[PDB]
């Protein structure tokens, strides 16, 4: 019932390591008793617990031209539009109307797709570099 | 046959200049140069004397200098005049003209 029992079980099973039990108890508290907890090696000397919230996937931007922060070579947008496409975006006609809507509403646009081919990608980089329109692929 | 700057097409060929390509969309989205293909809209700037298929006099071309015409996809001939680009077509290759 209590998280203290969770910490005690984790401590006993970890050869009496209090820190491991505390870390596991904290992770279970912050992601749920039936959440997803993964274990991986660390490059530091001490155990660390990191929580990934919201949605996050291991796919970065295609062309490093949409960077607008440069503090960590990252692109942040607030209150952004999202365009999700099952198929690749390659044609000019398949990308222009979304950009038109984003520009009219004056909001940044994230384009999540399988890939962005030469024509649409070139249009995106050109508009980002010249006009300054906020967009990312 | 109305001529152009030190040039005159022979027979039924018509010399035109393609309209400028569309750089930006209505909402301001700009297009790359390598895109947008080739412009099929042109302006007639030179017309030849006419064909000789019919016996007797000369039959002039249907178009006149200053007409806005729609070019076919293929069939033009590149001509360089004062470092600028023009295209020589046949009279019958022109698809139509924008009446206005």
Helix (H) or strand (E) holding A97: helix A96-105
Number of DSSP helices (H) and strands (E) in chain B, helices first: 0, 6
Q: What is the torsion angle, in degrees rounded to the nearest 10, for the CA atoms of residue A73, residue A77, residue A83 and residue A86?
A: 30
Instruction: For residue B28, give the nearest of A103, A119, A126 by CB distance.
Output: A103
Distance between A126 CA and the closest CA of chain B, angstroms:
7
Task: Tell me which residues of chain A have a C-beta less than 8 Å from any C-beta of chain B.
Answer: 92, 96, 99-100, 103-104, 119, 122-123, 126-127, 130-131, 133
Suggest the residue from B23, B24, B29 to mutate for an interface test with chain A (most A CBs closer than 10 A). Answer: B29
Number of other CB atoms surrounding residue B60 within 10 Å: 15
What is the number of CB-based contacts under 8 A between chain A and chain B? 33
Could you give the CA distance from residue B89 to residue B100 in angstroms, rounded to a whole number? 22
Check if the beta carbon of residue A108 is closer than 8 Å to that of residue A81: yes
DSSP reduced 3-state for B15:
strand
State the greatest distance between any 2 C-alpha atoms of chain B, in Å, as a whole number.
56
Could you give the CA distance from residue B22 to residue A120 in angstroms, rounded to a whole number? 16
DSSP assignment, residue B71? P
DSSP reduced 3-state for B70:
strand
Q: Is B55 on the interface with A (CB under 8 A)?
A: no
Number of other CB atoms surrounding residue B90 within 10 Å: 18
Q: Do B27 and A103 touch (CB under 8 A)?
A: yes
This entry's atomic model was obtained through: cryo-EM
Check if the beta carbon of residue B88 is closer than 8 Å to that of residue B79: yes
Instruction: For residue B29, give the nearest of A119, A122, A127 by CB distance.
Output: A127
């Amino acid at each position: 019932t209590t998280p203290e029992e969770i910490a005690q079980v984790a401590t006993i099973s970890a050869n009496g390591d209090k820190e491991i039990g505390n870390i596991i108890s904290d992770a279970m508290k912050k992601v749920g008793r039936k959440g997803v907890i993964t274990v991986k090696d660390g490059k530091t000397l001490n155990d660390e617990l990191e929580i990934i919230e919201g949605m996050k996937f291991d796919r970065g931007y295609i062309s490093p031209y949409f960077i607008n922060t440069s503090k960590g070579q990252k692109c942040e947008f607030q209150d952004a539009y999202v365009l999700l496409s099952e198929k690749k975006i390659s044609s000019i006609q398949s990308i222009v109307p979304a950009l038109e809507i984003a520009n009219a509403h004056r909001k940044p646009l994230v384009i999540i797709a399988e890939d962005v081919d030469g024509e649409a990608l070139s249009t995106l980089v050109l508009n980002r570099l010249k006009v300054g329109l906020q967009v990312v692929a | 046959g109305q001529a152009f700057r030190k040039f005159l097409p022979l027979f039924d060929r018509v010399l035109v200049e393609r309209s400028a390509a569309e750089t930006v969309t209505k909402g301001g989205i700009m297009l790359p140069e390598k895109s947008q293909g080739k412009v099929l809209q042109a302006t007639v700037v030179a017309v030849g004397s006419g064909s000789k298929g019919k016996g007797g006099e000369i039959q002039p071309v249907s178009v006149k200098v200053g007409d806005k015409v729609l070019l076919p996809e293929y069939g033009g001939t590149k001509v360089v005049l004062d470092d600028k680009d023009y295209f020589l077509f046949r009279d019958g290759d022109i698809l139509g003209k924008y009446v206005d």
